[PDB]
Write an enzyme that holds these catalytic residues in place. Structure first.
Site, PDB file in Angstrom:
ATOM      1  N   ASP A  45      -2.876  -9.394  -5.963  1.00 41.43           N
ATOM      2  CA  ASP A  45      -4.256  -8.998  -5.719  1.00 41.43           C
ATOM      3  C   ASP A  45      -4.707  -9.442  -4.334  1.00 41.43           C
ATOM      4  O   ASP A  45      -4.343 -10.521  -3.859  1.00 41.43           O
ATOM      5  CB  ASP A  45      -5.175  -9.591  -6.785  1.00 41.43           C
ATOM      6  CG  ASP A  45      -4.947 -11.074  -6.988  1.00 41.43           C
ATOM      7  OD1 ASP A  45      -3.917 -11.591  -6.507  1.00 41.43           O
ATOM      8  OD2 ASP A  45      -5.800 -11.723  -7.628  1.00 41.43           O
ATOM      9  N   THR A  78     -11.630  -5.180  -4.398  1.00 40.83           N
ATOM     10  CA  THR A  78     -11.764  -5.597  -3.005  1.00 40.83           C
ATOM     11  C   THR A  78     -10.719  -4.923  -2.127  1.00 40.83           C
ATOM     12  O   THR A  78     -11.013  -4.507  -0.999  1.00 40.83           O
ATOM     13  CB  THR A  78     -11.654  -7.117  -2.897  1.00 40.83           C
ATOM     14  OG1 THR A  78     -10.297  -7.514  -3.123  1.00 40.83           O
ATOM     15  CG2 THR A  78     -12.550  -7.788  -3.927  1.00 40.83           C
ATOM     16  N   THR A  79      -9.490  -4.805  -2.630  1.00 38.89           N
ATOM     17  CA  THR A  79      -8.483  -4.024  -1.924  1.00 38.89           C
ATOM     18  C   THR A  79      -8.957  -2.594  -1.718  1.00 38.89           C
ATOM     19  O   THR A  79      -8.824  -2.036  -0.621  1.00 38.89           O
ATOM     20  CB  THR A  79      -7.172  -4.033  -2.707  1.00 38.89           C
ATOM     21  OG1 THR A  79      -7.394  -3.482  -4.010  1.00 38.89           O
ATOM     22  CG2 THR A  79      -6.659  -5.448  -2.861  1.00 38.89           C
ATOM     23  N   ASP A 356      -3.582  -9.596 -22.470  1.00 32.68           N
ATOM     24  CA  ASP A 356      -4.015  -8.533 -21.566  1.00 32.68           C
ATOM     25  C   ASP A 356      -4.719  -7.413 -22.327  1.00 32.68           C
ATOM     26  O   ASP A 356      -5.689  -6.828 -21.828  1.00 32.68           O
ATOM     27  CB  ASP A 356      -2.827  -8.029 -20.724  1.00 32.68           C
ATOM     28  CG  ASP A 356      -1.888  -7.061 -21.463  1.00 32.68           C
ATOM     29  OD1 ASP A 356      -2.281  -6.355 -22.413  1.00 32.68           O
ATOM     30  OD2 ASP A 356      -0.704  -7.013 -21.069  1.00 32.68           O
TER      31      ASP A 356
HETATM   32  N1  ADP Z   1      -2.331   1.122 -15.318  1.00 36.48           N
HETATM   33  C1  ADP Z   1      -2.999   1.602 -14.243  1.00 36.48           C
HETATM   34  N2  ADP Z   1      -2.807   2.868 -13.811  1.00 36.48           N
HETATM   35  C2  ADP Z   1      -3.463   3.357 -12.743  1.00 36.48           C
HETATM   36  N3  ADP Z   1      -4.351   2.649 -12.025  1.00 36.48           N
HETATM   37  C3  ADP Z   1      -4.640   1.368 -12.348  1.00 36.48           C
HETATM   38  C4  ADP Z   1      -3.963   0.760 -13.502  1.00 36.48           C
HETATM   39  N4  ADP Z   1      -4.425  -0.499 -13.598  1.00 36.48           N
HETATM   40  C5  ADP Z   1      -5.320  -0.684 -12.593  1.00 36.48           C
HETATM   41  N5  ADP Z   1      -5.445   0.429 -11.848  1.00 36.48           N
HETATM   42  C6  ADP Z   1      -6.333   0.595 -10.670  1.00 36.48           C
HETATM   43  O1  ADP Z   1      -6.328  -0.578  -9.853  1.00 36.48           O
HETATM   44  C7  ADP Z   1      -7.630  -0.764  -9.290  1.00 36.48           C
HETATM   45  C8  ADP Z   1      -7.932  -2.243  -9.091  1.00 36.48           C
HETATM   46  O2  ADP Z   1      -6.865  -2.814  -8.343  1.00 36.48           O
HETATM   47  P1  ADP Z   1      -7.098  -4.058  -7.349  1.00 36.48           P
HETATM   48  O3  ADP Z   1      -8.176  -3.690  -6.359  1.00 36.48           O
HETATM   49  O4  ADP Z   1      -5.747  -4.485  -6.835  1.00 36.48           O
HETATM   50  O5  ADP Z   1      -7.642  -5.236  -8.299  1.00 36.48           O
HETATM   51  P2  ADP Z   1      -8.392  -6.507  -7.656  1.00 36.48           P
HETATM   52  O6  ADP Z   1      -9.608  -5.934  -6.972  1.00 36.48           O
HETATM   53  O7  ADP Z   1      -8.700  -7.386  -8.844  1.00 36.48           O
HETATM   54  O8  ADP Z   1      -7.368  -7.079  -6.707  1.00 36.48           O
HETATM   55  C9  ADP Z   1      -8.612  -0.085 -10.232  1.00 36.48           C
HETATM   56  O9  ADP Z   1      -9.541   0.704  -9.488  1.00 36.48           O
HETATM   57  C10 ADP Z   1      -7.768   0.807 -11.121  1.00 36.48           C
HETATM   58  O10 ADP Z   1      -8.141   2.176 -10.936  1.00 36.48           O
END
Ligand code: ADP
Ligand code: ADP
Ligand code: ADP
Ligand code: ADP
Ligand code: ADP
Lengths: 490, 499, 270, 155, 483
Positions: A45, A78-79, A356
């Protein structure tokens, strides 16, 4: 030397994005972070990535604090906000480089942000109701996917969603609430994982305090205590007066965290109590709040009504293990999950999958307004905004057009991080969402996104890949604000 | 000291060279387009607003640039003047596929998508092309006269421009044999009013010190024809001087016996011997221009003599009448009166000495515009209207194709937009707002709104009688797409010097 | 960036993998170490050379730390892990270059390891427990080829008792074991054969003045860290109490009144 | 400004497009027109002082070293070291004027310089040269008719 | 030895991307600095003047391959390069050159004796012009892109089927005449040999005409010199018109006096003759050259049966037909925008001609498009582990070198090579020999092309494999030389 400083700021933003670009998504790659003293850092992340990243350029720093303040609001995306902001910055810088003045760019970006945030409210989903059963199960299984435990996985999903919905709170605000620490894992021996069923309440594997317990007592007042009933040599030996007083107050099932008494068997069958050892404090607080009671520093000086109650207690041996079924208390918070197998160590995968699934179900239960996942929302906004711009008319056509094009950077990153060809998957998503608005018959096609488990187009409303509306709305607003702030600098 | 010849680096180098070539000739597109004086290095500066001439005089060494220039020249020799348009379109294709080849898009996918988009555009243009040939073009020529108007709109010469358009249009009906560039020419006359320009069924060439022999020719002669002689006629002592006198005497006798009204000699005829050579009793000239000859064999068939006393039937053959009058105070030399005088010359009668360039840009376009209007039937609104329509079609169809072709066709549609952009650039207006209004109106309101050069605003160029041959646009777009495909299809450059 | 970063990591991995690839086996070559002062040391051990060598690449440091932490986990095999990892990365060279994402490589490696575990569990010939003959065969297989060739009997008997004096039947059947609760006493002096095993811990410390009783038929040792505690111990009257406070002569007689024998200046290791 | 665009690449790998642009020069539109009209200042304000009865003479020397003092503007500008192409174009402007008139060489150069200078601070206000050209043609016809108003003839 | 391997590897990598129908074009600058665009591997390699002697060996082996098969040179380059680059790491392991040499020889023999086990051959015969034209689409798709194959196959096959006499077929009679003009669809087929002349005094219906080829093609004193020149020219033309000469061919120009003299005997003035015509005329109608205009003798004089101008293609060209064999020579008329894309078209025509000739020498065909390559690779790599000894490594490497070609074709098509090769190899176990790669789909999908008719030759492939293996073996043997 030095020219068109905005270009250098945009390049810095693009570099910051490229540092974090490949790490987005559950299948994103890890990063090595090195400081002056050479510490190790491995993560996926990007929130902690920017937390520990050593940024130097001022414009890049601005993106760093915008991402940080994004983190403090929703803690996710945030990414995505950083990538969206960088793409918007590079597109707007290009537009400036073909001599469109940035004020029109900013106006178009603001208008497009407003139009998109209004479009979200009219195309979200509220299916996370009592009638949503198969979607919850398959979402939990996608969270549990890539595991052999999926042979009996459907039963696990059913029991876990039933437990989390039964344990649901009712706060002052009225929105559903769920305590994460209330439910916990519990190993078992004998029969394999295919027979791991649901446990209606919290159960502790300890000594049989009172086997003569009725199957369903009329009232089981849970009285958790820390003082042990041990003989020594308001009483000199704290064995009888404390328990007698707490029984006379009204408490029925008196729990002592410490050891048992030598003759406590006679007392605990005539008073409906039992001394259960090895009570976890994180679980002692949970059971106290489930019954409605609180931990007692000392019984000396409340106990007639403050101590919580339950309407049944079961004392039976299940799967070669005797459990203290202090279940169905005053408040539905006492719960536990039995893990059938040999030990905790080889069942780490299944307990992690259960955790999860619990997290995703608790996230989708609250914030009833929900949106499809897998890039469906980005494709929908990209379909909306291009046409809306073309129908807008004023000088901000290209601003909104490039905004719509930049909203499709997240699907490209997801496709790359999933090892699939990015262009093919994003083109398939956009083409699938084309008829979602062009043809009103394909109205249900709006919920088409990426299947990260394989990298194929598939409906995710059924698949349950879900995100809160507030998270994405604030993400888009923060990205647009950051883009405006950077573009207004020269 | 940077070397870059790998596949992707070579592709980007080639298409960047094409981008530079386009950037060189960006601003010359359109009727109100500006120009540049380019010196060949020999002290001869060159001005020519036509982009094709600019590329012809331009020299670039890059192989990609050479291929693009060759394709432009090939387009130039086929139909109209679309070289600037096709070069700009191909360069736009390349510069918008930059961000696609820069990360791993294989060239063959791009080639296939470009072919598909080209087929889509060439098929979607035929549903919008409108034929006007039956709308009173051969007779009741108001529409064709308005087409002539469109080539010279918004100018104070309008009073003269109407007469000049009727001039050229009548010349078209009496020369409706698919007129070309060389079949019709112009000649410069100093002095006189602009309205005084009038059409003559022949040519005009003022006689100079080394052109003609003497004045008062028999203008009203029934059968005067051009006679070309490859023998000198102009003016040890008893061995070559007497030989010279004998040669002069026998040449004079040959001229007298031939009786040709017009006689041309290969050596220059000096005017200092006008009184000496006035005894020939018929018109004699010399140093005939090659253009004048080429405009006379096809007129009534001037002959050529190649012997000491060569005589031919066409020294005094059948041509209607000879014209020789005082033009601006100096007598010209008109080779008119020919049964097959398939060469109409517009007498450039004006009081401006430096009006030749404006005449070339203002009289050569009218004949070309009416010729292209007549030759083809289906036409579409010009001024970027058809380009915007094609861009809208390709953009709305790209989102319908599932596959990698989507982004490529989208970039193709985005690159079809430079024609209104370049036109409004050369007009001097800010491109952003005019292109914005044109695109919004074209996508939502109407399917034929184009750029306006006069009021500088978006207007339905279909109503403004802005026409263009559908087939010419089709083949120009096809050539541009083929050029883009060929230049994308490059992987490696091999030189292998002999030395 | 791009493939170049992974290539750098795995090249730094391969270098330290094959720097000591010769150092295992019963005929290991001996490596050559010199510090920049002229000091010379001749080494035959992979852990020692990897410890003394200095490298800066983060991948190399990470794998060195992996080997170091695996050393205490299992002991033997501390170099085979490095060799295997280096060779696997060197063969992954060829798949990283042909433009396949690392994710499929990770999946294939995990499937391969899953097959690894089952295949190892299959072909392994069974061996019994505590039977002298093949136990000594194991001793010859692993303990020998070192400096205890002529003194293997002492190591054999020490191991035979040690595997039986650390048994932990905590959550199963003796499957739990530790290697740090054995009261080992490495005292120089006399012939090497003087080593012996004694049931129960023993302490290098004792009472300064042995005018007092220490041995009782039922030693009820009680751990402890002002005489109030001394005469509050009388709650059960344990014969011996172990503490970490000094005892005076009058305090010692107070202990006798309390029926306890306390100790002083004893570390937590005891 | 200097060296054009300073990126040397799009991602960071070694790359190069323009051959030694550091010591080259790139001009696009307005900057080129400013260069031409600055040359126009040079030629015009050099030429101006030889105008009228109080018009002084000039000393101009080529690379050969020819001594030349004159008073007819075309003669001053005839052999001076012309470097810029539009300056040369003004030179043959004066040459043509002398050839077909023979007088008024000073007037044409100064008038052209003034027109071009005022056009440049017109452009400084952001106006495209086509409008200036049209306005100047209108001024030309106005001036021509004004001259025709008060013409006179001799013997 | 590694430097030679590096040189051969780089040379193979240069022309690898041109493999198959999806070959990238090349910017070819010849010695005389002329623009040239093409994708054929032989054209660039014949223009590539490489310097490393190992490269010389591999290129001359390819040249020998083209000598008797006419195509597949790109394949032999890719194959030999793969073989050498794998032999590089095999040597790096610590093996000897000798033992890998015997391993490669054994693998080559195994491949040769297993190849004839893929029987998808010609249907019935070289006849059925449409059927064989559908067969001849292989090399047409190879060199020229698949867009124009539908017409190119028919134009190429209709011409070669003109003279199927006694089962003997030849290539030199097949020629292509350069005719610029309209689009490719306007190209057609003709019988004989086509070239253009200048004058219009032409007679069509001509009996046996004697071809006069020239080795060297085209005040009182002034009048005397003019009369002498007139007499000399008349003497020259009457010397030309001796022995009843009816047709004369020349690469020179025309003149009014010259054409008057030619029409005095009613003789056409064939002028502006192509530079290539002087000896092809001699070899096609038994003609010979004349040192000057006076010595045309009947003994050293040509003989053609039909000499008439043809207006096909809206161009004036004279064609010679009904020769001694009465059908031997058969030209191809082309039409295109410029010679640049004409070159690729005529090279594809030559490749089709050569493949048809190979079919004449062998009616046996094998599946193409990565089918036979992966089939042979599977057979060899299955046989490899059954052979004890050190040759086993060389056997697997020979199999991998076979594997290389479909990977190159895939990456030229623009799809991911690894995915498609994995899918194809996996399916080939049960989706047997006729399966193979699919060009059109952007997804890496496989497709059985027994129905498609895209089947490459057998004898040509056999010789290509043998000669590439021999080239790799020979270049592997040399150790070093100072350079
Ligand atoms: N199994 C999945 N399939 C497709 N997209 C996913 C899946 N799990 C999460 N996502 C996508 O990942 C995004 C969040 O990722 P990320 O920004 O890396 O999390 P964080 O902000 O906690 O670091 C969400 O907008 C979601 O759409
Ligand atoms: N009066 C006009 N108003 C607007 N556009 C015009 C007008 N006349 C011509 N054009 C535009 O000019 C273009 C043709 O220019 P072209 O002949 O290609 O220039 P070049 O000869 O330099 O290549 C047409 O596309 C047309 O739209
Ligand atoms: N005498 C021997 N004969 C054959 N193999 C041996 C012998 N001694 C050790 N080995 C092998 O060498 C491998 C490595 O063991 P060793 O080098 O002793 O320790 P480490 O693994 O720490 O380097 C073992 O797997 C073992 O099979
Ligand atoms: N005596 C005079 N009084 C006023 N103006 C004069 C006089 N003599 C010359 N001029 C002006 O000087 C201008 C230019 O003259 P000059 O520079 O000497 O030669 P040229 O006419 O060739 O430039 C003329 O336009 C004229 O009006
Ligand atoms: N339509 C097609 N689909 C797949 N492969 C093809 C097709 N057409 C030709 N090929 C392959 O191309 C190969 C030859 O192409 P190339 O190397 O360019 O020329 P050459 O015939 O000289 O080797 C043949 O082996 C054949 O299998």
């Amino acid at each position: 030397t030095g020219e068109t400083i905005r270009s250098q700021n945009v390049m810095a933003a693009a570099s910051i994005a490229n540092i974090v670009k490949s790490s987005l998504g559950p299948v994103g790659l890890d990063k090595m972070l090195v400081d002056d003293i050479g510490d190790v850092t491995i993560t996926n992340d990007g929130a902690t990535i920017l937390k520990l990243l050593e940024v130097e350029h001022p414009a890049a720093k601005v993106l760093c604090e915008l991402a940080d303040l994004q983190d403090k609001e929703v803690g996710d995306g945030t990414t995505s906000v950083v990538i969206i902001a960088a793409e918007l910055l590079k597109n707007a810088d290009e537009l400036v480089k073909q001599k469109i003045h940035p004020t029109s760019v900013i106006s178009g970006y603001r208008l497009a942000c407003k139009e998109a945030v209004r479009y979200i409210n009219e195309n979200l989903i509220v299916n996370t109701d009592e009638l949503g059963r198969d979607c919850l199960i398959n979402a939990a299984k996608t969270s549990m996917s890539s595991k052999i435990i999926g042979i009996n996985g459907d039963f696990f999903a059913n029991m876990v969603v039933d437990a989390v919905l039964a344990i649901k709170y009712t706060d002052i605000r009225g929105q559903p609430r769920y305590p994460v620490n209330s439910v916990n894992i519990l190993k078992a021996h004998g029969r394999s994982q295919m027979e791991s069923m649901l446990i209606s309440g919290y159960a502790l594997n300890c000594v049989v305090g009172s086997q003569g317990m009725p199957k369903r007592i009329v009232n089981a007042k849970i009285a958790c205590l820390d003082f042990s009933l041990q003989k020594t040599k308001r009483e000199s030996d704290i064995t009888k007066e404390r328990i007698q007083k707490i029984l006379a107050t009204g408490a029925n099932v008196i729990l002592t965290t410490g050891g048992i008494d030598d003759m406590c068997l006679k007392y605990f069958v005539e008073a409906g109590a039992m001394a259960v050892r090895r009570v976890l404090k994180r679980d002692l607080k949970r059971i106290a709040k489930a019954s409605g009671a609180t931990i007692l520093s000392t019984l000396a000086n409340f106990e007639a009504a403050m101590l919580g109650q339950a309407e049944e207690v079961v004392q039976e041996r299940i799967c070669d293990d005797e459990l203290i079924l202090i279940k169905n208390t005053k408040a539905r918070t006492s719960a536990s999950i039995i893990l059938r197998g040999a030990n905790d160590f080889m069942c780490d995968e299944m307990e992690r999958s259960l955790h999860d699934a619990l997290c995703v179900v608790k996230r989708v239960l609250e914030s009833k307004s929900v949106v499809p996942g897998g890039g469906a929302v980005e494709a929908a906004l990209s379909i909306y905004l291009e046409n809306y711009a073309t129908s807008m008319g004023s000088r901000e056509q290209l601003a909104i057009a490039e905004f719509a094009r930049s909203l499709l950077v997240i699907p490209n990153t997801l496709a790359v991080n999933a090892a699939q060809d990015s262009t093919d998957l994003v083109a398939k998503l956009r083409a699938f969402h084309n008829e979602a608005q062009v043809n009103p018959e394909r109205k249900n096609l709006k919920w088409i996104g990426l299947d990260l488990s394989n990298g194929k187009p598939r409906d995710n409303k059924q698949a349950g890949v879900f995100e809160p509306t507030i998270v994405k709305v604030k993400s888009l607003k923060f990205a647009t604000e950051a883009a405006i702030t950077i573009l207004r600098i020269d | 000291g940077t070397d870059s010849s790998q596949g992707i680096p070579q592709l980007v180098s080639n298409i960047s060279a094409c981008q530079v070539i386009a950037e060189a000739v960006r601003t010359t597109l359109g009727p109100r387009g500006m120009d540049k004086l380019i010196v060949d290095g020999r002290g001869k500066a060159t001005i020519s607003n036509d982009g094709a001439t600019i590329l012809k005089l331009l020299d670039v060494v890059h192989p990609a640039a050479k291929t693009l220039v060759d394709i432009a020249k090939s387009q130039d020799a086929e139909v109209g003047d679309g070289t600037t348009s096709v070069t700009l379109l191909a360069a736009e294709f390349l510069k918008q596929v930059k961000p696609y080849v820069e990360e791993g898009l294989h060239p063959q996918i791009i080639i296939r998508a470009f072919r598909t988009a080209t087929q889509l555009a060439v098929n979607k243009i035929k549903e919008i092309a409108v034929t006007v040939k039956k709308a009173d073009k051969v007779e009741q020529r108001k529409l064709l006269e308005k087409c002539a108007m469109t080539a010279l709109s918004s100018k104070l010469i309008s009073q003269q421009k109407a007469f000049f358009a009727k001039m050229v249009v009548d010349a078209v009906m009496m020369l409706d044999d698919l007129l070309q560039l060389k079949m019709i020419g112009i000649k410069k006359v100093q002095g006189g009013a602009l309205e005084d320009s009038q059409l003559v069924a022949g040519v005009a060439f003022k006689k100079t010190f080394s052109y003609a022999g003497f004045e008062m020719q028999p203008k009203k002669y029934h059968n005067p024809k051009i006679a070309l002689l490859n023998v000198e006629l102009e003016l040890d002592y008893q061995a070559i001087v007497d030989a010279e006198w004998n040669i002069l005497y026998d040449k004079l006798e040959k001229i007298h016996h031939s009786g040709a009204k017009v006689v041309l000699s290969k050596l220059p005829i000096g005017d200092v011997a006008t009184q000496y050579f006035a005894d020939r009793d018929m018109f004699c000239a010399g140093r005939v221009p090659e253009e004048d000859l080429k405009r006379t064999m096809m007129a009534c068939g001037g002959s050529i003599q190649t012997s000491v006393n060569a005589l031919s039937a066409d020294v005094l053959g059948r041509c209607q009448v000879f014209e020789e009058t005082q033009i601006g105070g100096e007598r010209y030399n008109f080779f008119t009166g020919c049964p097959k005088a398939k060469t109409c010359t517009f007498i450039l009668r004006g009081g401006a000495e430096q009006f030749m360039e404006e005449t070339e840009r203002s009289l050569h376009d009218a004949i070309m515009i009416v010729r292209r209007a007549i030759k083809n039937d289906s036409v579409v609104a010009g001024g970027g209207a058809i380009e915007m329509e094609l861009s809208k079609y390709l953009r709305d169809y790209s989102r319908t194709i599932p596959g990698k072709q989507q982004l490529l066709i989208g970039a193709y549609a985005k690159a079809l937009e430079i024609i209104p952009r370049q036109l409004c650039d050369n007009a001097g207006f800010d491109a952003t707002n005019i292109l914005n209004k044109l695109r919004a109106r074209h996508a939502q309101g109407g399917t034929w709104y184009g750029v306006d050069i006069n009021n500088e605003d978006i207007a339905d160029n279909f109503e403004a009688f802005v026409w263009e041959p559908a087939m010419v646009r089709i083949n120009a777009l096809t050539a541009a797409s083929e050029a883009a495909c060929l230049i994308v299809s490059v992987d490696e450059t091999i030189k292998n010097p002999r030395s | 960036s791009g493939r170049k970063v992974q290539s750098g990591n795995i090249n730094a991995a391969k270098t330290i993998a094959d720097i000591i690839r010769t150092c295992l086996g019963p005929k290991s070559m001996m490596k050559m170490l010199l510090d920049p002062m002229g000091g010379i040391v001749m080494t035959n051990d992979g852990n020692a050379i990897l410890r003394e060598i200095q490298v800066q690449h983060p991948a190399a440091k990470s794998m060195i730390e992996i080997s170091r932490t695996q050393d205490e986990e299992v002991g033997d095999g501390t170099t085979s892990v490095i060799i295997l990892a280096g060779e696997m990365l060197s063969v992954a060279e060829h798949f990283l270059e042909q433009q396949m994402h690392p994710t499929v490589v990770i999946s294939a490696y995990r499937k391969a390891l899953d097959d690894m575990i089952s295949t190892l569990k299959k072909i392994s010939i069974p061996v019994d427990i505590s039977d002298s003959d093949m136990m000594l065969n194991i001793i010859n297989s692993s303990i020998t080829t070192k400096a205890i060739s002529r003194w293997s009997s002492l190591a054999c008997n020490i191991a035979l008792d040690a595997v039986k004096m650390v048994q932990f039947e905590e959550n199963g059947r003796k499957e739990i074991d530790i290697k740090k609760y054995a009261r080992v006493e490495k005292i120089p002096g006399g012939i090497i054969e003087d080593s012996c095993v004694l049931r129960g811990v023993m302490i290098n410390k004792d009472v300064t003045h042995p005018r007092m009783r220490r041995y009782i038929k039922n030693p009820r040792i009680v751990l402890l860290d002002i005489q109030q505690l001394c005469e509050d111990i009388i709650q059960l009257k344990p014969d011996v109490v172990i503490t970490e406070k000094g005892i005076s002569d009058l305090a010692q007689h107070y202990l006798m009144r309390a029926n306890i024998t306390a100790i002083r200046r004893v570390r937590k290791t005891d | 400004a200097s060296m054009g665009t300073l990126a040397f690449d799009e991602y960071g790998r070694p790359f190069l497009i323009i051959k030694d642009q550091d010591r080259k020069s790139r001009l696009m539109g307005l900057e080129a027109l400013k260069s031409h009209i600055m040359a126009a200042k040079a030629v015009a304000n050099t030429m101006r002082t030889s105008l009228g009865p109080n018009g002084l003479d000039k000393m101009m020397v080529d690379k050969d070293g020819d001594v030349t003092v004159t008073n007819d503007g075309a003669t001053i500008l005839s052999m001076m070291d012309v470097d810029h192409q539009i300056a040369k174009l003004m030179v043959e402007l004066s040459k043509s004027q002398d050839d077909e008139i023979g007088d008024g060489t000073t007037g044409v150069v100064v008038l052209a310089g003034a027109l071009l200078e005022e056009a440049e601070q017109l452009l400084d206000r952001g106006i495209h040269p086509i409008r200036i050209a049209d306005g100047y043609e209108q001024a030309a016809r106005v001036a021509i008719e004004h001259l025709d108003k008060i013409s006179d003839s001799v013997l | 030895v590694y430097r030679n391997i590096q040189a051969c590897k780089e040379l193979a990598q240069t022309t690898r991307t041109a493999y198959g129908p999806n070959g990238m074009n090349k910017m070819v600058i010849n010695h005389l600095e002329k623009l040239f665009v093409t994708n054929d591997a032989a054209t660039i390699l014949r223009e590539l003047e490489v310097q490393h002697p190992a490269a010389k060996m591999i290129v001359m082996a390819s040249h020998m391959q083209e000598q008797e098969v006419g195509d597949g040179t790109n394949f032999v380059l890719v194959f030999a390069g793969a073989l050498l680059e794998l032999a590089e790491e095999l040597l790096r392991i610590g093996l000897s050159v000798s033992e890998v040499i015997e391993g490669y020889e054994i693998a080559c023999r195994k491949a040769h004796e297993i190849l004839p086990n893929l029987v998808c051959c010609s249907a019935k015969n070289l006849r059925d012009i449409d059927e064989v034209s559908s067969l001849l689409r292989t090399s047409i798709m190879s060199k020229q892109y698949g867009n124009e194959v539908f017409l190119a196959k028919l134009i190429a096959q209709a011409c070669v089927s003109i003279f199927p006499d006694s089962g003997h077929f030849n290539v030199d009679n097949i020629r292509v005449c350069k005719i610029l003009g309209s689009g490719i669809s306007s190209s057609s087929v003709l019988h004989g040999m086509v070239f253009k002349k200048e004058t219009e005094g032409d007679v069509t219906s001509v009996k046996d005409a004697k071809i006069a080829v020239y080795s060297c093609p085209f005040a009182e004193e002034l009048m005397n010199f003019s009369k002498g020149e007139e007499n000399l020219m008349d003497a020259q033309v009457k010397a030309i018109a001796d022995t009843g000469a009816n047709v004369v061919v020349t690469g020179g120009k025309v003149a009014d006096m010259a054409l008057h003299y030619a029409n005095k005997y009613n003789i056409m003035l064939v002028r502006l003759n192509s530079k290539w015509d002087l000896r092809r005329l001699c070899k096609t109608v038994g003609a010979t050259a004349l040192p000057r205009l006076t010595p045309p003798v009947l003994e050293e004089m040509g003989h053609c049966d039909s000499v008439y101008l043809s207006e096909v293609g809206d161009t004036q060209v004279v064609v010679f037909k009904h020769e001694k064999e009465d059908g031997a020579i058969s030209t191809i008329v082309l039409r295109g925008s410029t010679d640049n894309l004409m070159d690729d078209i005529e090279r594809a025509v030559d490749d089709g001609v050569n493949t048809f000739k190979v079919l004449t020498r062998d009616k046996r065909l094998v599946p193409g498009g990565g089918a036979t390559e992966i089939e042979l690779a599977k057979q060899i790599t299955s046989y490899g582990e059954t052979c004890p000894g050190l040759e086993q490594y060389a056997i697997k490497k020979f199999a991998e070198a076979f594997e290389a070609i479909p990977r190159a074709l895939a990456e030229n098509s623009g799809v991911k090579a690894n995915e498609v090769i994995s899918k194809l190899y996996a399916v080939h176990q049960e989706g047997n020999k006729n399966v193979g790669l699919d060009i059109e789909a952007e997804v890496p999908a496989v497709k059985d092309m027994l129905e498609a008719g895209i089947l490459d030759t057998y004898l040509g492939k056999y010789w290509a494999i043998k000669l590439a293996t021999n080239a790799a073996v020979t270049v592997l043997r040399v150790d070093q030389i100072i350079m």
